Enzyme design. Structure first.
Site, PDB file in Angstrom:
ATOM      1  N   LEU A  18       0.918  -1.279   0.320  1.00  0.00           N
ATOM      2  CA  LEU A  18       0.080   0.060   0.388  1.00  0.00           C
ATOM      3  C   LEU A  18       0.871   1.433   0.587  1.00  0.00           C
ATOM      4  O   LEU A  18       0.862   2.354  -1.216  1.00  0.00           O
ATOM      5  CB  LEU A  18      -1.436  -0.059   1.197  1.00  0.00           C
ATOM      6  N   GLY A  19       1.712   1.048   1.071  1.00  0.00           N
ATOM      7  CA  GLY A  19       2.346   2.874   1.356  1.00  0.00           C
ATOM      8  C   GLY A  19       3.794   2.912   1.827  1.00  0.00           C
ATOM      9  O   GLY A  19       4.342   1.394   1.917  1.00  0.00           O
ATOM     10  N   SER A  20       4.551   3.477   1.192  1.00  0.00           N
ATOM     11  CA  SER A  20       5.862   3.306   1.974  1.00  0.00           C
ATOM     12  C   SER A  20       5.972   4.427   2.596  1.00  0.00           C
ATOM     13  O   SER A  20       6.303   5.170   1.939  1.00  0.00           O
ATOM     14  CB  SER A  20       6.997   2.104   1.044  1.00  0.00           C
ATOM     15  N   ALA A  22       9.370   6.262   5.973  1.00  0.00           N
ATOM     16  CA  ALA A  22       9.421   6.457   7.207  1.00  0.00           C
ATOM     17  C   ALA A  22       9.114   5.922   8.031  1.00  0.00           C
ATOM     18  O   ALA A  22       7.340   6.417   7.941  1.00  0.00           O
ATOM     19  CB  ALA A  22      10.191   7.683   7.342  1.00  0.00           C
ATOM     20  N   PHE A  23       9.272   4.855   9.290  1.00  0.00           N
ATOM     21  CA  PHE A  23       7.950   4.132  10.646  1.00  0.00           C
ATOM     22  C   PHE A  23       7.919   3.104   9.524  1.00  0.00           C
ATOM     23  O   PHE A  23       6.965   1.966   9.979  1.00  0.00           O
ATOM     24  CB  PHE A  23       6.452   4.811  10.131  1.00  0.00           C
ATOM     25  N   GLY A  24       8.173   2.237   8.028  1.00  0.00           N
ATOM     26  CA  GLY A  24       8.009   1.284   7.672  1.00  0.00           C
ATOM     27  C   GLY A  24       7.151   1.508   6.109  1.00  0.00           C
ATOM     28  O   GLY A  24       7.066   2.213   5.730  1.00  0.00           O
ATOM     29  N   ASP A 126      -0.006  12.109  17.346  1.00  0.00           N
ATOM     30  CA  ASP A 126       0.699  11.892  15.351  1.00  0.00           C
ATOM     31  C   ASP A 126      -0.293  11.825  14.631  1.00  0.00           C
ATOM     32  O   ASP A 126      -0.911  11.318  13.379  1.00  0.00           O
ATOM     33  CB  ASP A 126       1.351  11.083  15.124  1.00  0.00           C
TER      34      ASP A 126
HETATM   35  C1  LIG Z   1       0.710   5.562   8.649  1.00  0.00           C
HETATM   36  C2  LIG Z   1       1.017   6.296   7.348  1.00  0.00           C
HETATM   37  C3  LIG Z   1       2.172   7.214   6.986  1.00  0.00           C
HETATM   38  O1  LIG Z   1      -0.031   6.801   6.399  1.00  0.00           O
HETATM   39  C4  LIG Z   1       1.222   4.923   6.102  1.00  0.00           C
HETATM   40  C5  LIG Z   1       0.205   4.305   5.692  1.00  0.00           C
HETATM   41  O2  LIG Z   1      -0.241   4.098   6.507  1.00  0.00           O
HETATM   42  N1  LIG Z   1      -0.115   3.696   4.307  1.00  0.00           N
HETATM   43  C6  LIG Z   1      -1.753   2.569   3.791  1.00  0.00           C
HETATM   44  C7  LIG Z   1      -2.703   3.139   4.846  1.00  0.00           C
HETATM   45  N2  LIG Z   1      -3.646   2.470   4.466  1.00  0.00           N
HETATM   46  C8  LIG Z   1      -4.554   2.352   3.629  1.00  0.00           C
HETATM   47  C9  LIG Z   1      -5.723   1.264   3.311  1.00  0.00           C
HETATM   48  C10 LIG Z   1      -5.060   1.405   4.658  1.00  0.00           C
HETATM   49  N3  LIG Z   1      -6.227   0.626   5.998  1.00  0.00           N
HETATM   50  C11 LIG Z   1      -6.015   0.309   7.400  1.00  0.00           C
HETATM   51  N4  LIG Z   1      -4.467   0.638   7.324  1.00  0.00           N
HETATM   52  C12 LIG Z   1      -4.375   1.458   7.022  1.00  0.00           C
HETATM   53  N5  LIG Z   1      -2.822   1.860   7.381  1.00  0.00           N
HETATM   54  C13 LIG Z   1      -1.938   1.630   8.945  1.00  0.00           C
HETATM   55  C14 LIG Z   1      -1.673   2.881   9.503  1.00  0.00           C
HETATM   56  C15 LIG Z   1      -1.096   2.611  10.259  1.00  0.00           C
HETATM   57  C16 LIG Z   1      -1.290   0.860  11.142  1.00  0.00           C
HETATM   58  O3  LIG Z   1      -0.714   0.191  11.979  1.00  0.00           O
HETATM   59  C17 LIG Z   1      -1.010   1.303  13.558  1.00  0.00           C
HETATM   60  C18 LIG Z   1      -0.189   2.085  14.965  1.00  0.00           C
HETATM   61  C19 LIG Z   1      -1.555   1.879  15.640  1.00  0.00           C
HETATM   62  C20 LIG Z   1      -2.300   1.889  16.298  1.00  0.00           C
HETATM   63  C21 LIG Z   1      -3.430   1.459  14.770  1.00  0.00           C
HETATM   64  C22 LIG Z   1      -4.798   0.804  14.786  1.00  0.00           C
HETATM   65  F1  LIG Z   1      -5.592   0.242  14.449  1.00  0.00           F
HETATM   66  F2  LIG Z   1      -5.272   0.455  16.325  1.00  0.00           F
HETATM   67  F3  LIG Z   1      -5.986   2.474  15.419  1.00  0.00           F
HETATM   68  C23 LIG Z   1      -3.085   1.098  13.349  1.00  0.00           C
HETATM   69  C24 LIG Z   1      -1.709   0.468  10.059  1.00  0.00           C
HETATM   70 CL1  LIG Z   1      -1.575  -1.809  10.333  1.00  0.00          CL
HETATM   71  C25 LIG Z   1      -2.091   0.478   9.034  1.00  0.00           C
HETATM   72  C26 LIG Z   1      -4.512   1.935   5.722  1.00  0.00           C
END
Ligand SMILES: CC(C)(O)CC(=O)NCCn1ccc2ncnc(Nc3ccc(Oc4cccc(C(F)(F)F)c4)c(Cl)c3)c21
Length: 293
Positions: A18-20, A22-24, A126
């Site tokens: 999906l994305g890349s 900093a932070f992974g 954040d």
């Molecule tokens: C970050 C970034 C900079 O926005 C890059 C980025 O995440 N790009 C992909 C974005 N993305 C698109 C559809 C989509 N569906 C679901 N999660 C996405 N992103 C995501 C974000 C944070 C995650 O990790 C955490 C950490 C803390 C708390 C939680 C919680 F679920 F409890 F709120 C999740 C995960 Cl596993 C996934 C999604």
């Protein structure tokens, strides 16, 4: 029956990126405990699990929940896939079809989510439009809370342009510093995804804020809406609005949206459904996490 599921590597699959940065890296995938569409973020274990439990325990319609975790050489976080992606990209892509009603409802929803996190005594650290996700065009959810503190951002990269001045100068993070970031998030939405302080180096931001400079009034915003943003960026953190107050104010505005935001052709706007959405299709084309739970 675990609230935070410990997943074996064989229980989930990365399908696409999906994305890349900093932070992974975040992947789209499947959790196979049946097949459930998930996002997988690949970024002491006892402490990491303690923090992850809080992220798995949240239950609010406007806050994403962690479904599971896999601890190997890396930390991988597993959560429900949000099939319309992040709100920042969403507003940039649909800038010609987003009306006043939608913008104000998103503001309400984000405030509801953040109020819930305040009830959980959880500081986000954040909040930004990139960290709000679109479940459907009508329903958004906050994500990525508590990573900042889990990583150790209160000690010793930081999103300077979203941070309250006290967070910059003294690494102070409170629900009131989250209100500042909320202000910046609303500004991002109202400008259809402009970059805050564009062209201005991060190192100059504290001095700019100390001089009283702030993000400018978005073209669509009446002064009523801009004043909400400005109040979120007051140096006196205790004087900023509370999330409870922000729910009330934006809910009031959402009942007469064209009074508060001036958008050319507001009336005639339409956002793609799951069937018409290129993005939704790009992701999806067997059981939604909600249905599974
Ligand atoms: C970050 C970034 C900079 O926005 C890059 C980025 O995440 N790009 C992909 C974005 N993305 C698109 C559809 C989509 N569906 C679901 N999660 C996405 N992103 C995501 C974000 C944070 C995650 O990790 C955490 C950490 C803390 C708390 C939680 C919680 F679920 F409890 F709120 C999740 C995960 Cl596993 C996934 C999604």
């Amino acid at each position: 029956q675990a609230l935070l599921r410990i997943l074996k590597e064989t229980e989930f699959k990365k399908i696409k990126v999906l994305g890349s940065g900093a932070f992974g890296t975040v992947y789209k995938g499947l959790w196979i405990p049946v097949k459930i569409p998930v996002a997988i973020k690949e970024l002491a274990n006892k402490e990491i699990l303690d923090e992850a439990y809080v992220m798995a325990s949240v239950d609010n319609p406007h806050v994403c929940r962690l479904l599971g975790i896999c601890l190997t050489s890396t930390v991988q976080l597993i959560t429900q896939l949000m099939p319309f992606g992040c709100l920042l990209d969403y507003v940039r892509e649909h800038k010609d079809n987003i009306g006043s009603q939608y913008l104000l409802n998103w503001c309400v929803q984000i405030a509801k989510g953040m109020n819930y996190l305040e009830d959980r005594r959880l500081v986000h650290r954040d909040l930004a439009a990139r960290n709000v996700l679109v479940k459907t065009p009508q329903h958004v959810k906050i994500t990525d809370f508590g990573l900042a503190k889990l990583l150790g951002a209160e000690e010793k990269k930081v999103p300077i342009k979203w941070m309250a001045l006290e967070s910059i100068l003294h690494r102070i993070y409170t629900h009131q510093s989250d209100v500042w970031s909320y202000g910046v998030t609303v500004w991002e939405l109202m400008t259809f995804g402009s970059k805050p302080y564009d062209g201005i180096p991060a190192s100059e931001i504290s001095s700019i804020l100390e001089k009283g400079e702030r993000l400018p009034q978005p073209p669509i915003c009446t002064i009523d809406v801009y004043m909400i943003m400005v109040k979120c960026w007051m140096i006196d953190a205790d004087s900023r609005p509370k999330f409870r107050e922000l729910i009330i104010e934006f809910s009031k505005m959402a009942r007469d949206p064209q009074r508060y935001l001036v958008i050319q052709g507001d009336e005639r706007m339409h956002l793609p459904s799951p069937t018409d959405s290129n993005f939704y299709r790009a992701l999806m084309d067997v059981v939604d996490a909600d249905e599974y739970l």
